[PDB]
Write a protein that binds this ligand. Structure first.
Ligand SMILES: CCCCCC[C@@H](O)[C@H](CCCCCC)C(=O)O
Lengths: 171, 171, 171, 171
């Protein structure tokens, strides 16, 4: 009811999200951040990215029968962050070992032979800083790529090589 | 001064801004924020908006012969903030009494019979909070419409009505 | 480990409060708390403090023509808390800038050269914990002395000296 | 066009006032005058009174983040009137309902127990007569004490006693 949130996050409802049914709660301040890719289509406008966020949530809900879109946050090439399960709900993007001790953010697209535009890298880094600000992440939070906690090509070769340059990257 | 380099802002070179020739400085921290519209063409995608920002800087530099685009920041319906003279440099958006003491942000479009989309208002509000965090703005800063401090329709009847409900708005 | 787990508050009706005509609401969770004193006399019994809360209300309603007593809560030296406008209604105790974003608590009396008794300070700290427990105050809310946001000697030299030692005081 | 020189006022320049950042104007002729005291320590010489006017401003500007000392004028025990925000700029002394429609003058000192010397009272009345002659105040202006429009001991009991007898006062 006062000014909106840091990181300018597109709220669940704005991208016509089916309502969440998840209950497990994340014990924030959380240690880790896991960067992955959706391996779906990429989009570069808010109209094309609201549609894509909807589509990723629907594959997770209708087909895998999950309680909500598996990722805590989604990032579109349009340069905006899309609210997934948010800062407080356990995710479903990294396995039983990690989901409980991580926030999962996922870049919408396949980044094996492509890179996300700087604005998508920007929205991401800012979403992470707006994390501690709120007090959802720990000050010295570590960033792991998907393929560092699980056997998978995610987040793609090109994007995986960028996030290693990030200051908080590890292992 | 302080760590939290804040929010996402599309940089000058990305929107392909002509090099600025401005040198007068504002004194940190700034008390006032004047909100305006460009009464120009609107845009809803990262690509279309960079073009628009460029057109605005162009009309300003090339035809009005100012040192740079007149606004400190522009705001696109694409939901992204565009850098202008930035936080440190005196803009040219509100006349001689106000340009020396304010930060002028301008929504790109004609908000007479249209409100800007939610994401636009969010970036706009988000940018100000970042201003505060950086120390560019006063914690108790004040938001003013363009029409409050100059004879004009700017920033549109619709968006003027909207900014009136901002907690930092003082008439 | 369940619903109403906090504090003891003398309700409006129990102190004969005149009906409230205020309706504007605070946005929970509220981040700020402003500590004042009534600067008038004190009281140290259910009936005297209940009589006084009524005066302070009379002064604000009849003499000042206000919709309800200015404070969200008043603290008696009888060690009880008097429900003022409460947790959810914007008070009038700190100006147009702080009233909308804070909870105003007034200790009944004058503490320029006098401290409130141990139990009035417990009542007030206990009220705060209760505000957090309920999600009416941010877990990391801030305490401000009235003289820190308005020109006044309120809350009196001595009480002002005490609130500054508080875990939640931010100067 | 009647030309008088009612202004025996110590100019901001002369009391070493920091520069005002206030820009909101009062509409003349103003109908109300609100009398407050600074509740603070006092002065009785041009030298010490200029210094006190400095601290009173320092408090409002430095400790509180205000655009200028709060009062339109201040009254010294030395018999001189100090220029505050003046006749034309809305002061910040008596709240959002009264500030836009009143001139707030404040006696430098705490008058709960002393009365200000006759020369401070004369300075105040000649100050008001002057305003009326300039066309700044309605010939029939009403004088309110601070405690009459906001909850406060200001302007002090004894000086409150005195202003209640004034010709222009009104319940
Ligand atoms: C700024 C005033 C907003 C009012 C309180 C809303 C609050 O959620 C804020 C949201 C994001 C602000 C973070 C500063 C960059 C935060 O906790 O960080």
């Amino acid at each position: 009811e006062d000014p909106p949130a840091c990181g300018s996050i597109v709220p669940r409802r704005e991208w016509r999200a089916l309502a969440s049914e998840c209950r497990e709660r994340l014990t924030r301040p959380v240690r880790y951040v896991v960067v992955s890719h959706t391996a779906g289509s990429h989009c570069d406008t808010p109209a094309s990215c609201a549609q894509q966020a909807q589509n990723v949530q629907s594959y997770h809900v209708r087909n895998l029968g999950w309680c909500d879109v598996g990722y805590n946050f989604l990032i579109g090439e349009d340069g905006l962050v899309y609210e997934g399960r948010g800062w407080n709900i356990k995710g479903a993007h990294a396995g039983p070992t990690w989901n409980p001790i991580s926030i999962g953010i996922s870049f919408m697209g396949n980044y094996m032979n492509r890179v996300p535009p700087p604005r998508a890298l920007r929205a991401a880094q800012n979403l992470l800083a707006c994390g501690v600000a709120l007090g959802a992440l720990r000050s010295n939070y570590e960033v792991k790529g998907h393929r560092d906690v699980q056997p998978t090509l995610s987040p793609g070769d090109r994007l995986y090589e960028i996030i290693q340059t990030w200051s908080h990257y590890r292992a």
